[PDB]
Amino acid sequence: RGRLADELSLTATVLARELYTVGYRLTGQALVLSPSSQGDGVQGWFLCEAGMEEICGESMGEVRGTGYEVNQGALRWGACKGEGCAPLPNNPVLGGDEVQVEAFRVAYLEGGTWKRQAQAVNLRPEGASPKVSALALYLLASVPVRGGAPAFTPGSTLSYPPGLTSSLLELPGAPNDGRLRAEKLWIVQTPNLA
Amino acid sequence: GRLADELSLTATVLARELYTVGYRLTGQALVLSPSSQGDGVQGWFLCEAGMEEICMGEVRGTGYEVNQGALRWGACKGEGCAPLPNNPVLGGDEVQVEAFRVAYLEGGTWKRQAQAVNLRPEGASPKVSALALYLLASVPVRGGAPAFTPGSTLSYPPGLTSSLLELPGAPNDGRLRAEKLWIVQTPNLAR
């Protein structure tokens, strides 16, 4: 609980709902993961079925894309239509003001091993390549608080699934600036990529 | 602003959920319960595998209302289940949610009144094309903020008004206030 924790929970509900659908009834490129020291990027595509997803409203039987990235302390989102469309991530989700997003990490689970590396998933009639069963997403954010907060250790509040470690996620340190910090790790199943 | 961003995130969560109300459902799909003191909405839909994590071939319910300065959500499983709102979405502490309102669009006319939507194989009764949702929230801010007028920042569609929504006043208590109006299309309730 806490205002910032509640905002991170909202953010996770938005991203999880969107990413669960990636690959849905799709042939071709379904996911691209672009981890970097500056923040990770994730793009995904899926086929729209009428009635299921709001953004599909005008794209029945058509491919849609989705993308998330962090830039200048803000997590941003974009959406597009068309096979292989490049989302432009210009819609604010969280941060870039009082709230600073200090880390955004995405790892993936392939055959029981967690990885964080450049990766593209292609769905072929024979199957997915590689087979990705889940994504792990991590956010660290900070905000000012009158009187300061004690120094926060990223990773200290997480419950990891089997095989996932702070070392893989490359969690940053926290600058000694008195700000209130909160973090969130969440796992999103990706049955359409598996 | 930070509070505006928190209202945007909340709107996204609610929209994505309410858009699915009525999906492949026969029977009661939606109940709207407005009041001058705050609105409630409940809805039901069929779960199809691979649509959502929480979901196969079973009816689910979903509900929202404000209680004690928090917008809360509830869920249930089963035909006719009551989704008792039991978890905070936004507010209930530093953030206070002061108003939640839901209106509906029926044949070109925006309405806000007690209403249930029923779905039959032939179609919906009444035929609801969209919902409009409104939130007002406040937070403390060092140095205070000026007096806010609810409705003052909204872009309304034609026929939707502050009077229709029964928007409240705001006290001149120095808290920072923000509001959001958003429209959710409801094609499953329009067929």
Author numbering:
A (entry chain B): 42 to 235
B (entry chain A): 43 to 97, 101 to 236
Give sentences from the paper.
Type IV pili (T4P)1 are long, surface-exposed filaments which extend from the surfaces of bacterial cells. T4P are composed of both major and minor pilin components, although major pilins comprise the majority of the pilin subunits within each fibre. We identified a cluster of type IV pilin-like genes within the T. thermophilus HB8 genome, using the program PilFind. Three of the remaining six, TTHA1218, TTHA1219 and TTHA1222, yielded crystals of truncated forms which enabled us to solve their structures (designated here as Tt121836-123, Tt121933-236 and Tt122238-123).
Tt121933-236 crystallized in two different crystal forms; the higher resolution form, at 1.85 Å resolution in spacegroup P21, has four molecules in the asymmetric unit, arranged as a dimer of dimers. The interfaces between monomers were analyzed by PISA, which revealed that the interface areas between chains A and B, and its equivalent between C and D, were substantial, with a mean of 1488 Å2 (the next largest interface area was 439 Å2). The CSS score for both interfaces was 1.0, suggesting that Tt121933-236 forms a dimer in solution. The monomer-monomer interface is dominated by the helix-helix interaction across the non-crystallographic 2-fold symmetry axis. The second crystal form, in spacegroup C2, has a dimer in the asymmetric unit; crucially, the interface between the A and B chain dimer is preserved in this crystal form, providing further evidence that this dimer is not a crystallization artifact. Formation of a dimer in solution by Tt121933-236 was investigated by SEC, which showed elution peaks for both monomer and dimer, as well as a third peak in the void volume, which appeared to be associated with contaminants in the preparation. Tt121933-236 forms a more complex fold topology than XcpW and the related T2SS pseudopilins, with two main differences. First, two additional β-strands, β8 and β9, are inserted into the variable β-sheet, which extend this structural feature into the same spatial location occupied by the short α2 helix in XcpW. Second, Tt121933-236 contains a long loop, from residue 184 in β10 to 221 in β11, which folds back over the external surface of the conserved sheet (marked in orange in Figs4c & d). Tt121933-236 is also stabilized by two disulphide bonds, between β2/β3, and β4/β5; both lie within the variable β-sheet.
